[PDB]
Amino acid sequence: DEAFDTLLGFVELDHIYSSALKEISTKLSILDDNFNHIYKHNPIHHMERRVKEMRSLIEKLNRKGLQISAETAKEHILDIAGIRVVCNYLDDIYLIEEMLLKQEDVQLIKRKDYIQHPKENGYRSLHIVVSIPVFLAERVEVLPVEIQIRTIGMDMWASLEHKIRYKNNAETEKYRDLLKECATEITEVEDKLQQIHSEITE
Amino acid sequence: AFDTLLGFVELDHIYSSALKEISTKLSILDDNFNHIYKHNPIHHMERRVKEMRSLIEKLNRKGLQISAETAKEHILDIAGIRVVCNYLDDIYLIEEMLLKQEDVQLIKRKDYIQHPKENGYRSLHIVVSIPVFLAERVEVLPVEIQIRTIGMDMWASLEHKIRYKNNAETEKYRDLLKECATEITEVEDKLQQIHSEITE
Amino acid sequence: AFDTLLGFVELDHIYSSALKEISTKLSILDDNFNHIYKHNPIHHMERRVKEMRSLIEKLNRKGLQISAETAKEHILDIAGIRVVCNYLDDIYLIEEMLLKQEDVQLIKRKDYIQHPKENGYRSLHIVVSIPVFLAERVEVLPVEIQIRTIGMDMWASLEHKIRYKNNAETEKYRDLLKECATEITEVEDKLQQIHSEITE
Amino acid sequence: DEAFDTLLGFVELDHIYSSALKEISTKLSILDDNFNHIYKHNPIHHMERRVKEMRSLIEKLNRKGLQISAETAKEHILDIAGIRVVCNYLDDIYLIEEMLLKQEDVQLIKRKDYIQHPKENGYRSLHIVVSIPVFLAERVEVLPVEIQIRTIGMDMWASLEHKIRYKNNAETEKYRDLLKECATEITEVEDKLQQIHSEITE
Ligand SMILES: Nc1nc2c(ncn2[C@@H]2O[C@H](COP(=O)(O)OP(=O)(O)OP(=O)(O)O)[C@@H](O)[C@H]2O)c(=O)[nH]1
Numbered sequence: 130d131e132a133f134d135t136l137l138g139f140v141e142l143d144h145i146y147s148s149a150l151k152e153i154s155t156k157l158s159i160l161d162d163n164f165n166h167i168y169k170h171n172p173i174h175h176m177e178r179r180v181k182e183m184r185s186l187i188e189k190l191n192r193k194g195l196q197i198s199a200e201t202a203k204e205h206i207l208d209i210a211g212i213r214v215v216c217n218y219l220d221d222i223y224l225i226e227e228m229l230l231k232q233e234d235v236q237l238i239k240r241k242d243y244i245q246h247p248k249e250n251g252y253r254s255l256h257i258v259v260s261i262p263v264f265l266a267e268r269v270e271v272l273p274v275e276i277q278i279r280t281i282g283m284d285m286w287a288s289l290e291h292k293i294r295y296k297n298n299a300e301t302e303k304y305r306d307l308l309k310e311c312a313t314e315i316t317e318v319e320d321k322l323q324q325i326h327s328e329i330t331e
Numbered sequence: 332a333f334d335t336l337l338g339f340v341e342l343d344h345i346y347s348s349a350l351k352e353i354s355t356k357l358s359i360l361d362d363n364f365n366h367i368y369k370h371n372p373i374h375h376m377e378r379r380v381k382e383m384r385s386l387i388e389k390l391n392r393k394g395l396q397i398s399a400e401t402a403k404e405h406i407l408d409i410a411g412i413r414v415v416c417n418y419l420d421d422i423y424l425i426e427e428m429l430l431k432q433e434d435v436q437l438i439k440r441k442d443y444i445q446h447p448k449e450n451g452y453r454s455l456h457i458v459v460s461i462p463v464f465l466a467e468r469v470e471v472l473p474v475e476i477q478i479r480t481i482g483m484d485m486w487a488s489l490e491h492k493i494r495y496k497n498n499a500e501t502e503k504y505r506d507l508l509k510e511c512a513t514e515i516t517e518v519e520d521k522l523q524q525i526h527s528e529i530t531e
Numbered sequence: 532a533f534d535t536l537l538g539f540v541e542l543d544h545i546y547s548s549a550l551k552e553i554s555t556k557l558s559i560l561d562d563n564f565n566h567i568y569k570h571n572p573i574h575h576m577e578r579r580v581k582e583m584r585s586l587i588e589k590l591n592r593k594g595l596q597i598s599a600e601t602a603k604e605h606i607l608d609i610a611g612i613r614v615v616c617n618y619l620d621d622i623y624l625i626e627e628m629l630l631k632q633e634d635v636q637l638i639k640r641k642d643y644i645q646h647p648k649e650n651g652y653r654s655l656h657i658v659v660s661i662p663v664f665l666a667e668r669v670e671v672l673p674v675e676i677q678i679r680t681i682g683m684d685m686w687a688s689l690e691h692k693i694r695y696k697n698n699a700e701t702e703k704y705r706d707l708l709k710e711c712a713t714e715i716t717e718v719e720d721k722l723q724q725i726h727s728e729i730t731e
Numbered sequence: 732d733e734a735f736d737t738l739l740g741f742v743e744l745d746h747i748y749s750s751a752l753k754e755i756s757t758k759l760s761i762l763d764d765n766f767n768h769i770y771k772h773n774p775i776h777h778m779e780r781r782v783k784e785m786r787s788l789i790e791k792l793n794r795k796g797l798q799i800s801a802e803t804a805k806e807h808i809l810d811i812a813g814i815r816v817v818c819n820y821l822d823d824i825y826l827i828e829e830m831l832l833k834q835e836d837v838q839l840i841k842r843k844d845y846i847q848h849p850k851e852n853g854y855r856s857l858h859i860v861v862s863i864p865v866f867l868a869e870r871v872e873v874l875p876v877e878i879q880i881r882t883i884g885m886d887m888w889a890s891l892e893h894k895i896r897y898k899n900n901a902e903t904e905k906y907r908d909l910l911k912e913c914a915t916e917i918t919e920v921e922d923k924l925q926q927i928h929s930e931i932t933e
Pocket residue numbers: 206207208241248250252256277286287288290291
């Protein structure tokens with residue numbers, strides 16, 4: 130087992146995917162600011178970025194039966210770069226998607242809509258993987274970025290469900306029912322807030 | 332020599348420094364609670380120094396002289412910080428942790444969580460003083476801290492947007508906003524109860 | 532309806548966005564050069580959008596109409612970024628790396644390093660355009676990039692502070708500032724020569 | 732060798748010394764901004780913070796003959812938290828020191844002045860270790876912070892000398908003489924800039 134260059138391979142990945150996050154963050158910040166400038170509403174509440182830790186990446190590769198290599202990771206793992214866009218209201222989610230995908234150097238790679246089709250546990254979010262060019266010192270990389278788009282309420286719910294799920298399944302089955310209740314109650318109140326906000330901005 | 336009250340520019344400078352002092356304290360508390368218990372009580376923070384426009388209006392509203400000296404004496408929210416927390420009990424955790432510090436003095440406390448306003452507003456308001464070390468002197472300045480949950484914050488942002496138009500028009504939503512505040516309260520109570528159980 | 536030229540507020544908004552686009556590009560280049568060669572060519576960066584006050588004066592100075600449309604057409608430094616580099620050759624490294632990018636177009640180049648101004652000023656100035664993706668349209672906007680070493684920057688900050696008083700008074704230092712520029716040049720040449728040797 | 736708790740000890744150190752850096756950074760930012768507000772000069776050009784990496788800390792402990800433990804590190808290693816304050820002009824260095832040490836919760840612990848007494852290789856900087864209180868969730872720590880105060884020119888010189896020194900002594904002896912020349916030439920030009928700046932701000 131002499132392969133130390135596999136480790137260098139993953140260190141490169143961390144560096145270039147971190148740069149992809151900066152490119153998309155800047156795009157999103159500009160969209161939010163311009164929309165606010167025109168319509169006096171910020172669709173984005175806040176954003177969170179993370180590059181997948183190498184340990185988490187190797188486990189995912191193993192989980193999926195894939196080789197433990199950077200070439201394989203770059204080809205088959207689409208969430209090495211992840212950004213979470215937390216929006217103020219439900220309709221902001223799809224506004225953000227539309228504004229970003231219109232851009233000529235952003236290509237849609239994968240789309241999963243858990244808002245129209247929530248997961249069994251009650252999870253909601255719009256997930257889009259997009260590619261963006263990253264201009265490095267001596268080459269260009271076109272890299273995927275996984276964007277999770279959700280409301281404040283979806284994010285509150287997901288953070289709590291995550292914390293339960295990441296402490297064994299015994300506990301994740303007491304709260305299953307009550308967590309579903311919460312997801313639905315969050316859905317209902319955000320619908321009302323959205324309804325009010327739409328009327329006062331006609 | 333007319334009312335060249337430059338003093339208000341001085342106010343903005345030193346109250347902005349007080350905000351940096353308190354923000355640093357809060358960030359350290361959040362980081363350390365996370366280090367020990369694996370939970371961040373703070374979701375995010377927002378700071379603002381009261382604009383001179385709003386400040387003069389408040390002084391007039393209260394029948395006070397239009398001067399920086401009078402503002403520093405009578406207006407406790409020139410420096411404001413908003414601490415948005417993840418769960419209801421984080422609000423009181425943050426308060427307890429800040430007031431334990433030896434260079435933090437409590438000046439005023441209003442808890443609109445235990446006693447919500449008529450329209451449904453909820454938040455814990457504490458005014459504290461902190462020392463600010465300047466180039467040639469020390470100032471002990473008040474800072475208004477609004478501590479609230481994410482849910483309370485969403486509600487307040489929406490209600491604020493209503494009130495800040497022709498304020499007469501669009502008071503039909505009073506009833507429906509109150510419903511939302513109650514519904515947010517109930518869901519956050521349930522989230523809090525779950526979070527308490529899985530963390531002992 | 533008098534000259535409610537709100538247009539200048541529009542200008543500030545979109546040229547500020549262009550600055551974010553270029554800054555992100557430069558930061559990524561610096562990070563990657565460091566990753567490969569273990570050197571950061573960038574020491575730090577400073578951004579500013581030209582104030583409306585200065586902008587109208589420039590339009591008047593050039594005999595141009597006082598309008599945002601005219602400003603966007605004729606003023607190439609509404610958005611300015613200053614890239615302060617660690618060594619002299621970093622200046623040209625940064626230029627080469629930026630101009631290689633396919634969505635960056637060169638508009639104008641003035642090299643006051645190869646041809647210093649009379650007072651001793653030195654810097655590389657390149658105006659480039661970049662696309663800015665807004666909510667409902669694309670804008671291709673010029674950005675003035677001043678690229679200089681740390682030594683050039685120290686000199687310029689001091690000279691700027693002189694010129695920006697009663698500008699008639701304090702022109703005795705012209706001679707002594709020129710000496711400093713030459714002395715800074717000579718030391719930075721020597722630092723550069725050492726740095727080149729220990730990095731092959 | 733079961734001591735895994737030694738590693739936890741050092742992880743605590745990183746966390747609390749990082750907090751000490753935030754406290755001192757905020758103090759310094761406020762001083763610079765207030766001085767600028769009054770006198771229209773920013774004495775600070777920029778600041779750089781770093782918490783010593785655990786590897787570097789263990790090597791220093793070994794170099795000094797000290798036990799490999801967090802208690803020992805906290806007692807005997809004064810640069811776990813380091814901040815570098817780069818100033819615009821020479822006199823700014825001592826202004827910053829004076830303004831900071833006047834504060835009632837800052838105590839001077841150690842002072843080494845390589846400006847009045849430069850090192851043989853030509854290194855210049857004012858080094859002060861100070862203590863500051865850090866208010867944590869359940870306790871207070873009074874922690875040292877090593878502050879390196881220097882001009883822009885001293886910093887340019889030190890960065891280059893560092894890069895030479897950290898590639899074997901063979902090369903660090905060709906440039907010794909020329910590096911001394913540079914340090915002196917930087918000293919002389921900054922004296923002139925300082926002299927001009929003093930006259931135009933009388
Ligand atoms: N808190 C929470 N997060 C979830 C849940 N499902 C997904 N996520 C998050 O959203 C990410 C992407 O989810 P998916 O869109 O379903 O991923 P995928 O389609 O299976 O493709 P791969 O993730 O690469 O395997 C996950 O990695 C999680 O971070 C859930 O039930 N609760």
